[PDB]
Structures are given as structure tokens and as C-alpha cells.
Write a protein that binds this ligand. Sequence first.
Ligand SMILES: CC(=O)SCCNC(=O)CCNC(=O)[C@H](O)C(C)(C)COP(=O)(O)OP(=O)(O)OC[C@H]1O[C@@H](n2cnc3c(N)ncnc32)[C@H](O)[C@@H]1OP(=O)(O)O
Ligand SMILES: O=C([O-])CC(=O)C(=O)O
Ligand SMILES: O=C([O-])CC(=O)C(=O)O
Lengths: 92, 1021
Amino acid sequence: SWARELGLIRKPASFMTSICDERGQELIYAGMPITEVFKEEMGIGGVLGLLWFQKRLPKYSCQFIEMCLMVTADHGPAVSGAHNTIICARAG
Amino acid sequence: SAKAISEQTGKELLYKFICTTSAIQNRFKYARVTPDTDWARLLQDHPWLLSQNLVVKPDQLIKRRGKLGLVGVNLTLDGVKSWLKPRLGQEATVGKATGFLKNFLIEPFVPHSQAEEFYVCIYATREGDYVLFHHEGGVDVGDVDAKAQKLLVGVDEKLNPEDIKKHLLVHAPEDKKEILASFISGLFNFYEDLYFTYLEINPLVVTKDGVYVLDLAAKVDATADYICKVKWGDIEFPPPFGREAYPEEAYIADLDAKSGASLKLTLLNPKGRIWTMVAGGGASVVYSDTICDLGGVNELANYGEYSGAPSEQQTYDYAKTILSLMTREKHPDGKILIIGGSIANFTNVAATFKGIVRAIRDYQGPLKEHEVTIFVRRGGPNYQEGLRVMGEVGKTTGIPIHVFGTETHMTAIVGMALGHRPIPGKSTTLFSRHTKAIVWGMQTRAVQGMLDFDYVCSRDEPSVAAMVYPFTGDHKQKFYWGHKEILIPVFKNMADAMRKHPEVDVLINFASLRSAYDSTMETMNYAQIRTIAIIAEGIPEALTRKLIKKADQKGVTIIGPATVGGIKPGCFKIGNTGGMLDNILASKLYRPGSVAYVSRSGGMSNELNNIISRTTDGVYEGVAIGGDRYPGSTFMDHVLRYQDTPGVKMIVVLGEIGGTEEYKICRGIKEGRLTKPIVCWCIGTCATQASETAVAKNQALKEAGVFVPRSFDELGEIIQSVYEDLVANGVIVPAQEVPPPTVPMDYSWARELGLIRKPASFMTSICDERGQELIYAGMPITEVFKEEMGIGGVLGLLWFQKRLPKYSCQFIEMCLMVTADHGPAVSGAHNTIICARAGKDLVSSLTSGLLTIGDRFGGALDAAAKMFSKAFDSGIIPMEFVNKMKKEGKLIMGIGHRVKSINNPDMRVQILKDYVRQHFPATPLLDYALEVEKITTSKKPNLILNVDGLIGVAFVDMLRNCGSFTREEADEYIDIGALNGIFVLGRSMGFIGHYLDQKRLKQGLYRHPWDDISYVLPEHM
Ligand SMILES: CC(=O)SCCNC(=O)CCNC(=O)[C@H](O)C(C)(C)COP(=O)(O)OP(=O)(O)OC[C@H]1O[C@@H](n2cnc3c(N)ncnc32)[C@H](O)[C@@H]1OP(=O)(O)O
Ligand SMILES: O=C([O-])CC(=O)C(=O)O
Ligand SMILES: O=C([O-])CC(=O)C(=O)O
């Protein structure tokens, strides 16, 4: 930690992460800080465009992402995955 | 690498793979007699042997036996028996060489005349294949090259027989002109389908009866075996005829064969005082040349090398053999051991010196007894700590060891060892600062070294535009540019590499010795690639000549095979030339100089960079052409290239023994084409065509106007003398030294020599994966399998890190056999089936069913162990325990079966109960659980012990009451969850069985019908 602080050593980094700069003064998302996220009033479609695609999508596309996350919510407990969730929840 | 084969082997290969109209007689008619075999077996399997008249001659790679009269012709049984009696197995001499005669060949002798003997030969040259035919065969040659007809055939060119009869058959008898020529044509295909370099048949007897190949000789390309191992079968190369090898020499031979290192040792005078063990090939040749200059032609004990960074056991045994060989008998002028060497490219010098210091301290007694003095001189990455450890073992064990770094001359230390001095078309520019390369192959340390060099030489763009690796997709690899990280694209094909990067003009071919030719031929189908550097070693020479031919046709500058590359300082660096960046900064290779050089071996190029750094201004551009026989660009192709560039003022050439290449430099300096001051020196004297030697080329360049030193010791001195000549004439001005940019060093290299501590996480007291054996808990994998412990023993090793006693390993196998599948109706196997019928995966199905192992399903093992252990540890009677559980809700976990309980048992509680009764010392918690079973079966005819409760209490009974668990480890593993581990690892077999079953019955997706659901939703939310 000291030989790298005064910068006399090389260490190759893994985990290249082109998303979510967590350290510093703000949670920078794709390139947009968190206060700019809540200032432009982009919903979860805007942060899906920022996290998943790293692009500020236009406001008709964020609302379509929220629409297609509202229709692909629950579709009854008969289906195979919701059945497994219920079976695993009833085992407590 | 031409290696001469036995004439028995080449003669049987000629008998097997020739295809011609002329019938070869005596097909498969030969015998090999030797001292290791008898005589009756040869007559037993070859019944043709004593039917005719025979000729017997020694097959031990001996030239000129027909002129010297050492052949026994016209021999019957008495001739072939009493001829070998003064000959088979006795010591004899030919030329200089003295040794045994243990190999003799027996051929059916054919009487014939001297007007029927012919002479045919095919030898390889750089510009093609020469076939050479004299009508007068045998030993009566007369004139040799004048009346014998020659024909140069080109590479990748077909031999036309009309040019055979037109040009080569001038002095032939005409009736054999269809017998010989097509045969020769067939022989030419035999030369071209088996990759010979030299094949001379003399004499070839073309009688009226047919053709007879009595005597031949063949040097074959030993590196082409990957093409022709189906043709040669198991080829055998005989050693050149000489004395017998010591056991030490065969010991070093199997040390050489057993790894990727080069451990060469051949003793010269075993009672000698000056013993050499020196890293590098050219460095060994130069040290042997200099010690032969200083009167040690009888005092050099051996010539050898240790190269390719051997392991410290290999280094230890190699130095052990050389140290034991030099303590046999004392020599009164003192015995010297020279651990010399060139500058190491990337090897940590201190690790090889750990090998040396173990091999010296292990054999120190004979060293201080025989009064041995050790002279050590090395260079490279971290040489200074290695000189320090050699110095401390010099002062510690008392052996006088004189250590030296790169500040000294390389081979002047032997002058300090002997007391002679006291001890202290093709383009003319190849690389520019916009030269971009494409590397072929994942050779990331070479690309990182090139990027470090180009940061240090203040270059603005990295000279590796892309890499090419065919065995992976297109991605980008992260490299270091100074401090920063950049992304260099790695491609799959070369076509989209040349497409996306049109500024490339160099390709550096890091492919192997069998894929260099195809990638190089594919590369020259792109016009922008103007030079190709081929780092591979071991290409067959015919494929190299095809590469040279297509290079001259396309106009590219091939650096030649078996190179290390060639460094143009301040500008560009090919691969691993120069070495690690410590040698680049130590030799001032970050700014251009004025001296160019051309060498052959890569081991001498670092020494030449060191010499030109320490004596003169520095290297403008250096090129190592390759240690192969046909380099892609010779000496003249580079000194002509240094002629036209004005930045260079003087040229240094390091030539080698063999190959009339420096005579072309002599003719170029006599024709007035080479005007810049040349300093040539040719290595390889070895005087312990007669013009191809080192002293011949040295004298011929000395008389031609080229500065040639007396030895290698005066090479730096006269290079400094020519530099002082050239600056005093007022043309060489030394440029002003700007300091280079600095790179940070490495985390891998600073921790290797230990200069930066790092806190390690992930403490892992289990499974040392690295080393020779996969060491489980403290016990290797061979001790696991040899001691015959099942999977219960490896669960004791992985989970508990103890070697459990043999009755409890079988108990863990037992309780993993009963906690396997228990039907598919239960909740977890139901989830596995539901996920397997969705066609998912094995691991996703097992995992989706495994995530149910919780508290209600599968959580009776751990709870039924914890409950009974807390009741027993407290110390209450069972009748109070049942009443305590009744008073608080909380049904006793591990007690209760739905169907089978009393005189209708569970039948797998019974097997486990019989096992914990029989093979199992001192089991009190099971007895307590059986008393609680007595009470709760007195309550209800159900309520027998479960299998969950009995595995729980039997496992807690196994932990604390067998050995090796104290009381706080056996109580730790219950609270950690080592019983949930047994239920999950046991039930994993059942869940994978359910996955494979539902995947094998081809079952469709589940739906769980609506009539089993009863939706109870609110009215309007
Ligand atoms: C032909 C004809 O018509 S019949 C003639 C006349 N008919 C009659 O008289 C009717 C008789 N009625 C019966 O026989 C009924 O079976 C009954 C009412 C007595 C039920 O008796 P049971 O089944 O034994 O009681 P129950 O199911 O609650 O369990 C009994 C015990 O097991 C205990 N127990 C159950 N599970 C566990 C467990 N895992 N761990 C520890 N204890 C347990 C219970 O706590 C209970 O304990 P307790 O006796 O201290 O209260
Ligand atoms: O790059 C090279 O060929 C040199 C090398 O690795 C070594 O010295 O072991
Ligand atoms: O251990 C468990 O609770 C699961 C079990 O035996 C069962 O199939 O009923």
C-alpha cells in the first residue's frame, strides 16, 4: 500500500468493470452521478439503461423498459419457477 | 541441423523408399555384426548369408576407406570370421580419432570393373540443391570438379529429365543413359521426400545386370522428423567415431534429455586445472577460444554449457558432476573453476546461484582440500545479490571466490585467473518511430517487454498494434504503457489483423518449429508486411529455403530463424532481444548511438550491447541473424543495409566458424562498396574446406583492411580504439545524455526477490494445491490412495483435517449411503425434478433442489444432534428430558416415524445401529438417545428413532469419543454445521440421480394444474 502510494510499483488489475464507479464523492453510474440520475427524473428504466447498456436512453424507452418489467412480473403460481419459489418458501 | 546417419540405415531407407524403373539389386541384403551379438543367429534368420561371396567393412562414419584400403572384399565364412578377429572390438585410429570398432556391415560382394563404377552426389546449398555426377566412380577420381557434371536445381522446382540427359549425362555410356538417369530422378525424389541434406553414393556400379549401391553417405535434417517419422521409423544417429564416454558424460546426457534445458559437457583433458562451467553457447565458445589463446589448449579440461535456465536440482547435479571431476587429482599450478557467462535475458541470476551455492557447500571439503579458486562473472536481472551470496560463501567456507559483474570484460577474468593481469526490392530502413508490429502468438512477456522498451525510448505510440492467436476469439489484452493500462487487440485470423491495422509493417513470428512456415507463407500474401522476424528454432532447411525464395520474390526482409530478434535502440526492439529492462538501462539502449553490429547467436548480442555501451558511444542498430544454417538475411544483407544509412558511423561483425560469408564482406570492401570502419571477429577457433575456420576468416579479414583483434579480450579495447579514431577525425560527436523515463518495476518481480510485503487474505487451512503432489489436509494424494481410505478418509481430511480411524471413515460412507435419495415426493427432489423438466442444467437442477435443505427439510440431522447433545451435556435423566420438551412445545427432533416403528423397524436405523454398536468404542450419547427412544415408544407405538436422529447422535458420538478431537473441536463442528454437510453431500447423489432420470425419460415442462391451487385473492386492491 505504501510502495504503490508513492508509485514505484506495477500491479496488473483484473475485473475491468465499465459501470458504477463506487468510490469518490458520489455513486457515479455509467457516467452519470446519482444526483444527476435523480435530477433528470429517470425512473428505473433510466438506471437500467445506465447500468445495463451504459447509455442514457430517451424518455420513451425508459418508460417502455418499465412497461416490460411490469408485464413480465408475476403470472400466477402454476408456472414452474413460481412453483419452485413456493416449494422453497414452504420449507421456511 | 545435418546429422550423419549410419550407412546401414540410409542404405535400408534407400532400399525401402526409392521409386524408379531401374531395379536395385541386393535389396535388403545386409548384416550388422557387433560384439553384443553372436554369429549363429544371423545365419539362422538370414539363410541367404553363406550362399554367396561377401564384403565386410566398418560402419562407424569413417570417410575414405576405399583409398585407405580398410575394406575387406571377397570374403567367404573364413574371411568374414577371421577378418573381424583383429578388427571387431579393438582400439584403432583414423585421422586423429581413436576408439573401438564395434560396428561392422556385411554386404554381398559383387565383382565388377572400374569402367562400370559411377559417382553420384546431392548436397544442399542455400540457393538450391546440387546434383554432382562423375562417370569415373571409385577411388580413381582424376580431376574432381572439372569433368564431373553439376546441376543446380531450384527450391520448389521440379527436376526435368531432359535437362538431366542434356547437361548431366555428357560423358556417360549411352546404354545406361536410361538406366542411370531415371534412377537419378528417382534418387532425387528420394532426396526430396526424406529431407536429406547430403547424400553421396560412391561407388555406384551400373553393370549390365542393373544398379548396385555399394557405398553411400547421408547427412539428414534431424529437425524434419515431425514430417518424416513415418518414413524413417525409428531413425538412429551414430555419434562421430572417437573414444568412450565417461559415466559422467552419460550422466550429463540424461540430465540434458530429462528437461527443456541445455546441459552440455564434453571433457577435453580430464587431468586439467582450468575447469569451465559457463552459461550460453556462444559464451562457452568464446571462453574456450580465449583459454585456447592463453596457452590452455592442454589445460582446458572440458567444454560445455548450461542454458535455458535449468532447475536448481539440474544446476545442483551439473555443478556437482563438474566439482567432483575436478577434485580427482591435484594440479600443482592451482585448479580454477570459471562460472562465467553472458548477460542473462530474463533469468534471476540469484536463483541459479542458489543452485551453485548448494552444489559448492555440499562439496566444499574437496574444494578446500584441493586448493580450488572459483572465478564468477555474470550479468542480467538481479545479478548483484547473486554476486553477494557468492561473496559470502567465499568468505564463509574459505574458498577464494572472485566475483565480477558487468563492469568487467566477460572473458578477461581468465586473464585474472592465470595471472596475466591483476585483480581489482528489400528496403534499406526497417524500423522507424512509427514502425508498428503484429505479434503472432500469445507471448505476453515479449509484448510487455517491447512496450516497456518503447516507453523508455520516449516513443509516442506503442509498436505492437495487435496480436494474433488462432486458438481464441477476438478480444483485447490489457498491457502496461509506462504507468497506464492500454488495450492491445488480440485477433484470431491474420486477415482482419491486417485489415483493422494498416500501419503495420513488421510481423514477429513467435510460432513453433512446425507452424512457422505456414504462418510466414500466409503473412507474405499481405503487401504491407515489409519484414518478418522468425523467433522459432528447428525449422527444416528446405522449408527455410522456400521461405527465403518467397521473401526474395516478394521483397520482404526476413530476419532468419533461431534468432532472438534485433534491437534498434531508441527506436524498436524485436521480442526478447536485449533482455529485461534492467539490461536495457544498464547498456544505455534507450538512445541511439553510432555503432551497428551483426552477430549470429543471441547469447553474444547482450555481450555486444554491453561492450559497445562500456567502450564506445552505443548501438545505433543491432541484428542477430540466427543460429541456423540458412539465415533469412546474411551478413552482407545487413552490412549493405548499414552502408546506406548515414546515422551509423562504424560496423562490428561477429562471425562464426563455417560458411563462406565473411569472404563476401572481404570482396565488398575490396570493390569499394563498404567504406565505414568494420571491426570483424570470428569465433570458434577450436584448434586444440580449410578456409571456413575462425583463424582463416580472421586472417583474411585482417589482411583486407578490417580491424580484427588478437583475441576476444582486446575486442572491446580495439572497438574503443576505432571509436577514439573516429571522434578525433571529427565525424562522431557524442550526443548529450538525457535521462530516460522511468517505469515502476513489477509486483511479480519485486515480490520474487522480496522487496515489498503484501497482506494475504483467504487463509485456507486445507488442500495445498501447488507443489509436486496435491496435498490434502496434511497428507499427499499418493498417501491417500496408498493407505486405502475411501471417501470417508478424504471427508475426514477435507472437512475435519484429521486422519480419522478406519471404523469411522466407513461410518461416514455408511451415513452418506443412507442419506442418499429418499423418493421424489420430498421437497428438494421435487425442486430438482421441476428444474430438470424445464430442461435446465445439471448444476442448476441440483442447485434449485439443493436450496431447500434448510430447517423443515433436511434440518433434523443438525437439530437432532444439537438437542440431544444439549440435553446430555447438561446432564439430566431421559425421563426429565422428555418432560422438559413436553412442557415447552417443541417436539423432540429426531424421534418419530410416520409408518414403521416398533417390531416393524426402519431397517436403515438398524444397520447404522448395528454398526455403531459393533465397531465403535465408548458410545454414551447413542445410549442416551436409545433411552429417550424407550420412553417415547412407551408413549406411542410410533416415535422410534429416525435415521436423522440416529445419524445425528451417532455422529456427535463419533466426533467426541474417537481420538484426535478434543472436546471443543467436536463441539465446534456441530455448531458450524458439519451435519448439514453430510445431508447435503449425501442427498446430492439422489438429486443428480433425479436429474439424470428426468432427463432420460424425456419429460416435458411442468404446469401444476389450477384445480390444486385455490386462489384466495383480495376483492379490489
Ligand atoms: C370400535 C370403536 O368404536 S372404539 C371403542 C371406544 N373408542 C374409544 O375409546 C376412543 C379412544 N381414542 C383413541 O384411542 C385416540 O387415539 C386418542 C384420543 C387416545 C389419541 O391418543 P394419541 O394418538 O396417543 O395422542 P397424540 O397423537 O396427541 O400423541 C401422543 C403423545 O405422543 C407425543 N409426541 C408426538 N410426537 C412426538 C415427538 N416427535 N417427539 C416427542 N413426543 C411426541 C405427543 O407429545 C403426545 O405426548 P403426551 O402423551 O404426553 O400428550
Ligand atoms: O527469451 C529468451 O529466449 C531468453 C530466456 O527466456 C531465458 O534466458 O531463459
Ligand atoms: O431429513 C429429512 O427431514 C428429510 C427426510 O428424511 C424425508 O424424506 O422425510
